[PDB]
Amino acid sequence: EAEVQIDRLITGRLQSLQTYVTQQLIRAAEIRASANLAATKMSECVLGQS
Amino acid sequence: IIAYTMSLGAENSVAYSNNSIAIPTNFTISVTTEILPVSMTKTSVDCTMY
Amino acid sequence: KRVDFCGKGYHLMSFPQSAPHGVVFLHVTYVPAHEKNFTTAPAICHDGKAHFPREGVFVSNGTDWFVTQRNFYEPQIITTDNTFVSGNCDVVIGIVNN
Amino acid sequence: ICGDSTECSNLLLQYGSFCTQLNRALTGIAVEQDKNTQEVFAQVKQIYKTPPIKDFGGFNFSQILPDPSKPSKRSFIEDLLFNKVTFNGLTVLPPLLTDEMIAQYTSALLAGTITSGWTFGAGAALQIPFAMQMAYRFNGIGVTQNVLYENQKLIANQFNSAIGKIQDSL
Numbered sequence: 001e002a003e004v005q006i007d008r009l010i011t012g013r014l015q016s017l018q019t020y021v022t023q024q025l026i027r028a029a030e031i032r033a034s035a036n037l038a039a040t041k042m043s044e045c046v047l048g049q050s
Numbered sequence: 051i052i053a054y055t056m057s058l059g060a061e062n063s064v065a066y067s068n069n070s071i072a073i074p075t076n077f078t079i080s081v082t083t084e085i086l087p088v089s090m091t092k093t094s095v096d097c098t099m100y
Numbered sequence: 101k102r103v104d105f106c107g108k109g110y111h112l113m114s115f116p117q118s119a120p121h122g123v124v125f126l127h128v129t130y131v132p133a134h135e136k137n138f139t140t141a142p143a144i145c146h147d148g149k150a151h152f153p154r155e156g157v158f159v160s161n162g163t164d165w166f167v168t169q170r171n172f173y174e175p176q177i178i179t180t181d182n183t184f185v186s187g188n189c190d191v192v193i194g195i196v197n198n
Numbered sequence: 199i200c201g202d203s204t205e206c207s208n209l210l211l212q213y214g215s216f217c218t219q220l221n222r223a224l225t226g227i228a229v230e231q232d233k234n235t236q237e238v239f240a241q242v243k244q245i246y247k248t249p250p251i252k253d254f255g256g257f258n259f260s261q262i263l264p265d266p267s268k269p270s271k272r273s274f275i276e277d278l279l280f281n282k283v284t285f286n287g288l289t290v291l292p293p294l295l296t297d298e299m300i301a302q303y304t305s306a307l308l309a310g311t312i313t314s315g316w317t318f319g320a321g322a323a324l325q326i327p328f329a330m331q332m333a334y335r336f337n338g339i340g341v342t343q344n345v346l347y348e349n350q351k352l353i354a355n356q357f358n359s360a361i362g363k364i365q366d367s368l
């Protein structure tokens with residue numbers, strides 16, 4: 001039965017880690033979009049007149 | 051195998067002055083590439099078969 | 101006209117080519133080269149009036165003084181047709197007699 | 199999820215490869231962050247430097263140019279910005295670019311845009327006096343250079359006051 005208890009703990013921790021990874025992926029996508037916008041602004045409004 | 055500190059590039063001090071300009075006298079025409087993905091493979095999955 | 105959007109330099113035209121799952125752009129651009137250094141002044145004082153260039157800039161190879169375009173060296177003699185007048189020259193910082 | 203236990207590892211073994219793809223995703227995220235920084239800041243072929251003498255028609259860039267006296271080689275505004283804003287199997291990796299290199303990129307960009315205008319973004323940098331560059335920009339926005347060449351002093355004073363107000367507000 002110790003193995004059953006360990007199984008419960010394992011599945012709970014795995015679920016939590018999966019949730020964390022998914023949230024990190026979403027946030028990374030948003031940050032990448034922001035970085036692309038910043039790169040375009042640096043290219044246009046610093047190296048030239050828009 | 052050698053480990054070093056990366057260099058940001060070359061370095062020059064452009065000769066600024068308040069009554070001097072630089073004007074080009076010749077030109078070149080260059081051709082460059084850029085590659086952009088637009089699609090990914092269309093796939094389908096069946097539950098009961100899986 | 102938006103800088104560095106397609107091609108490093110002034111943009112001229114582009115050509116598309118297909119790809120297995122994407123596209124490939126060939127950008128044709130114009131890049132200046134072989135620069136030369138010159139002496140400059142923002143306006144010319146004549147008869148007490150100030151003259152500015154319509155499009156271009158004043159330069160000189162030591163003497164003479166000419167008007168050129170900004171992206172290609174091509175001197176021309178200064179005439180009342182490629183310049184315009186604005187007031188008397190006492191406030192402009194950098195006037196030269198000619 | 200096991201904390202160095204043999205039986206826990208053995209039990210976890212029968213779940214397949216649930217952990218290779220997690221590390222794969224995290225490494226992808228890290229590489230993406232490095233690429234983001236590199237592509238946003240590295241846009242200069244060379245590293246330019248401002249001339250020792252600074253007479254930009256009355257404009258004053260002292261608040262923004264780097265200060266060699268300070269060890270960080272950062273500007274006043276950058277230092278204000280940096281001052282204002284503040285294990286169980288997990289690690290944090292340092293970025294590929296240190297802060298000094300980023301500051302050096304910013305300094306190079308700003309020196310290039312002060313001295314050469316917009317020319318250094320297309321080919322090789324070509325020098326030009328700052329007043330003539332401002333005249334070009336006014337000509338760009340639809341106003342003749344007459345206005346700048348007649349109101350240089352007022353324009354410079356307004357710019358300096360605005361930059362000081364920005365410093366104070368920040």
Ligand SMILES: *[C@@H]1O[C@H](CO)[C@@H](O[C@@H]2O[C@H](CO)[C@@H](O)[C@H](O)[C@H]2NC(C)=O)[C@H](O)[C@H]1NC(C)=O
Pocket residue numbers: 075076077
């Ligand atoms: C502008 O550049 C082009 C190419 O760099 C020059 O054309 C070359 O001139 C040399 C000198 O005689 C020749 O040996 C090459 O064969 C030319 N190249 C081509 C593709 O024709 C041109 O002379 C330069 N213009 C000026 C005014 O210097």
Ligand SMILES: *[C@@H]1O[C@H](CO)[C@@H](O[C@@H]2O[C@H](CO)[C@@H](O)[C@H](O)[C@H]2NC(C)=O)[C@H](O)[C@H]1NC(C)=O
Pocket residue numbers: 063064065072135136137138
């Ligand atoms: C045009 O003239 C200027 C000034 O004479 C030249 O500037 C030189 O730049 C080099 C490299 O920075 C220095 O070693 C020289 O001492 C500078 N000359 C001086 C200060 O008289 C410039 O190279 C010339 N050519 C161009 C294309 O600008």
Ligand SMILES: *[C@@H]1O[C@H](CO)[C@@H](O[C@@H]2O[C@H](CO)[C@@H](O)[C@H](O)[C@H]2NC(C)=O)[C@H](O)[C@H]1NC(C)=O
Pocket residue numbers: 161162163164
């Ligand atoms: C600056 O360029 C001008 C444009 O050609 C030169 O003017 C003529 O140059 C030729 C060749 O040297 C002479 O034979 C003519 O007598 C010049 N005419 C005039 C009105 O100047 C000028 O010599 C050049 N100056 C320098 C210092 O290079």
Ligand SMILES: *[C@@H]1O[C@H](CO)[C@@H](O[C@@H]2O[C@H](CO)[C@@H](O)[C@H](O)[C@H]2NC(C)=O)[C@H](O)[C@H]1NC(C)=O
Pocket residue numbers: 068069193194
């Ligand atoms: C451009 O810079 C030069 C210096 O390179 C300035 O010339 C100075 O002018 C002041 C006021 O007349 C003199 O006290 C200095 O002795 C001059 N310097 C030198 C080295 O002679 C000039 O005023 C600046 N502005 C222009 C030409 O419009």
Ligand SMILES: *[C@@H]1O[C@H](CO)[C@@H](O[C@@H]2O[C@H](CO)[C@@H](O)[C@H](O)[C@H]2NC(C)=O)[C@H](O)[C@H]1NC(C)=O
Pocket residue numbers: 195196197
């Ligand atoms: C351009 O020419 C004018 C007039 O020929 C010069 O103005 C003279 O300047 C001297 C010295 O200050 C005065 O003594 C004269 O009374 C002025 N004359 C006039 C009509 O204003 C002017 O100095 C010249 N500019 C340069 C740079 O030499």
Ligand SMILES: *[C@@H]1O[C@H](CO)[C@@H](O[C@@H]2O[C@H](CO)[C@@H](O)[C@H](O)[C@H]2NC(C)=O)[C@H](O)[C@H]1NC(C)=O
Pocket residue numbers: 258259260261
């Ligand atoms: C550009 O602006 C700076 C403001 O930061 C000026 O530096 C000030 O100069 C005054 C007079 O020497 C001093 O009392 C202040 O303490 C300085 N401020 C700082 C933060 O050091 C600088 O003088 C201006 N540039 C010019 C050419 O006037």
